[PDB]
Amino acid sequence: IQNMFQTKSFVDRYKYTEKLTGLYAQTLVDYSGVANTSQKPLIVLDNACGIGAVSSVLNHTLQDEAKKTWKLTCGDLSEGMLETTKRRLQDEGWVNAETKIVNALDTGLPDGHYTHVFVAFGFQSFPDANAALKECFRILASGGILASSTWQNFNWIPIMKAAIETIPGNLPFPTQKEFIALHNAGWDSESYIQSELEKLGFRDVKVIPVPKETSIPIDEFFEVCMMIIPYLLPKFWTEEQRESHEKDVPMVLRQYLQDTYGANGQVPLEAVALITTGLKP
Ligand SMILES: Nc1ncnc2c1ncn2[C@@H]1O[C@H](CSCC[C@H](N)C(=O)O)[C@@H](O)[C@H]1O
């Protein structure tokens, strides 16, 4: 049995999906205070780092003096994700950085080691977010900061649903709220997040909704859809529906996007992410 995040097909399209998660990488780094903090040296984990969105921002945002003494660990469960991150580390010239297989549910990392742990769009992807959150608390030093981003709303699932509705068969498709809660519910709620962090002993917890709007060419948006739809069909369609229609999804998506946004058009991306910070005493 495969994990979706470890398949080459998924990793290879993730650069298009990073156009969506990357909307909040600068937000998360800047809201964490890592560029202004009194903690020194910086010991940073990019947890569930993907292809390195947060790590890339950190390397472009932090002072040279701070990078002389910091250590950055880019952690992920997926060997394929880390292979891509490692190429980016080399290409962008990150300093004092390393990739490492890190299971967010059981990191193997030391108690009280990190000044900062970033979890950019990980908690709604982990099998159990609470276990991952407890690990974050364990591995942070006194005074350490957890900074996370999670989805509250976004328009791309509704766009895909509208495309799917142009197929005969009245085919099911998740709502945004269903999609974001497939693994862990609650991470679209400020009050849930605050309560969960506080129950573990985090203090000074802040949860801020941040709206973003941009646009992406239809051909790049198509790749995002193609990365996600195949993992939803076994859950939302019957076997007969898949036999009848799965092969038609690419054409339907192309046609919907061209018809709606233009043959050389741009898809509006609109989202709200919750940007959470908490302090370990
Ligand atoms: N148990 C686990 N431990 C660590 N990473 C995990 C994990 N389960 C899934 N992941 C990783 O979680 C990531 C979610 S996508 C987010 C990637 C990146 N932080 C960004 O902002 O773009 C993927 O890279 C996936 O491989």
Author numbering: 7 to 287
Original authors' sentences:
We and others have shown that A. fumigatus effects dithiol gliotoxin S-methylation via a methyltransferase, gliotoxin thiomethyltransferase A (GtmA or TmtA) located outside the gliotoxin gene cluster. GtmA consists of two domains, a larger ‘upper’ domain containing a Rossmann-fold involved in binding the co-substrate SAM and a smaller ‘lower’ domain that changes its relative position to the upper domain in the three crystal structures described here. apo-GtmA seems to be highly flexible, as indicated by the higher B-factors. In agreement with Duell et al., who have recently published the structure of a GtmA–SAH complex in the same crystal form as described here, the cofactor binding site of GtmA is located in the upper part of a cleft between the two domains built by helix α1, sheet β2 and loop regions connecting β1–α2 and β3–β4. Our data suggest that GtmA methylates dithiol gliotoxin by a non-processive mechanism.
